[PDB]
Amino acid sequence: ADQLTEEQIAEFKEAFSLFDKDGDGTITTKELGTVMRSLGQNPTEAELQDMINEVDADGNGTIDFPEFLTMMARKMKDTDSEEEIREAFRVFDKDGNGYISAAELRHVMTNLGEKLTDEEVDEMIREADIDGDGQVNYEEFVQMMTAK
């Protein structure tokens, strides 16, 4: 009847790939919890399996597009948010100054991803900056998607 849009859904098709460790196309308690702590948390398997069991179709410990769509789509269905931008920024930078240096970005990137090099990160960061300072700033992220 109604599902996420090209932009929303898009981030979803991509998420399922970033969430999991290898990109099985589904999120589990092992993957969910992993990323959770990868940022700055420390939940138990109970909250991971419980939360997933409440959204998982078959309740086997992993979510699928069909059950995830209606869940995230029914609760969410809009572009980025001021909270997400700032929040994500608080978790990226170790000092929360707003500037994400490759050291930090690569750290989180490889944490959720597989393996990232100093060149790839600096290449992705420097190429991201507007004026190029070696790191990424809030104004950079916003300008990156929106702003001018």
Binding site: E11, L18, F89, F141
Partner: peptide, 28 residues
């Protein structure tokens, strides 16, 4: 659009907000 290749961090924070919101609670 200051530079090229922005979709990256975009999906990055999106995953951060959706994972933190989904995993825990409180939509948006």
């Amino acid at each position: 659009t200051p530079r090229r290749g922005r979709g990256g961090f975009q999906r990055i924070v999106r995953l951060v907000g959706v994972i933190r919101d989904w995993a825990n609670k409180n939509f948006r």
